[PDB]
Structure formats: C-alpha cells, structure tokens
Structure 1
Amino acid sequence: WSSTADPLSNLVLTFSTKEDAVAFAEKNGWSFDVEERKVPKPKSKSYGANFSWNKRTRVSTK
C-alpha cells in the first residue's frame, strides 16, 4: 500500500476570492505562491464561415 508521513497531504481549502485565501495563509504563517486566474478569451464563432466563397475557413466535410 501507499504510505505517507505528512499530515497535510489531503488538506485543500476553498475560498471565494484570492484575497481571502492570501489573508488566511498569512495569518497561519504559511509561505504561499499565488497563480492568477486563467479565463478563456472570448472567441468569434461564425457558422456561415464554414462555407466561405474565398477563405480557407471553408470546411471539406460536415
């Protein structure tokens, strides 16, 4: 079986914002690394572009 010796291997906390998590980590004395939130960028979707007269976006199959 898989054995461990650190008691915090299953500790995961949930926070509403990054600032709340940072404050909680700071008051508990834990050194922290913060990674910024990644949001997918908005994209331009056009169904008609599938059938373009002169562009490469024309599809060869459906």
Structure 2
Amino acid sequence: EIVSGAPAELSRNRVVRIYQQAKPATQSGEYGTFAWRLDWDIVDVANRWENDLIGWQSSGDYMQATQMKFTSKESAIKFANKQGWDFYIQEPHHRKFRVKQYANNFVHSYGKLKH
C-alpha cells in the first residue's frame, strides 16, 4: 500500500478514531446514533495554542476539524485501511431493556414511600 492522493505523512504518524457518536444526555433525541465518525486526534504539540494579538485559537493541525459521516463500521474500517492509516475503533453502548409498568405505585409492608 502506497497512498495515491494523500500528500501528507498522515498515514504513518497519527492515530485516528472510528466511533459511534454518543447519545447526548441533555436532549432526548437520537440522531447522532445513526452515523459513524472518523476523527483525527489532537495528540500534538500543535494542538490548538492561544494567539497573543487578538486571542483567537490559531491551531497548527492542518486537519483539526474534520469529520466523515459513514454508514457502517465495517465500511468505515474498510475505508480506513484502504486509504491506510492507523485507527482505533470504539464500540458504542446501548440502553438496556427494563420493563416499565407505569403501575409501580403499590406496596406491601415496607418503610420507604415515594411520590
């Protein structure tokens, strides 16, 4: 494998991340569940320093903010080995079934009571 159209030396140097985007806890709504994300890490010395004149954050990463949006993890990883750089995959985490009787508002002899 040689890269055909990747002029950087990205392919030998950085660790990239394949991850399912996490389910946000603040809003309910789950559209970030249905992607797959490619993200380059900031494991860098460049790694977004601070400017001194105005005080923006001029980075040094030429590919700081970049996200693919893929369809399947194995299609993601076949791309990731096809264009050929070092990855790390991260498994998502679901929410487990728990039976919810709305009638959970009844007791025997028991100390604690709720709303």
Classify the TM-score, shorter chain: 0.7 to 0.9
What does residue 19 of structure 1 align with?
74
In structure 2, the CA distance between the partners of 1:7 and 1:59, relative to structure 1 (3 Å rule), is farther
TM-score, normalising length: structure 2: 0.45
The aligned counterpart of 1:54 is 108
Note the aligned Cα RMSD (angstroms).
2.0
Higher normalized strand content (fraction of residues): 2
Distance in 2 (alpha carbons) for counterparts of 1:7 and 1:24: 21
Q: Which has the higher contact order (CA 8 A, sep 6+)?
A: 2
TM-aligned CA deviation for residue 59 of structure 1: 5.1
1:10 paired with 2:10, answer no
Gapped regions of structure 2 (runs ≥ 5): 1-55
TM-score of the superposition, structure 1-length normalised? 0.78
Structure 1 unaligned regions, length at least 5: none
Q: Which has the higher helix share?
A: 1
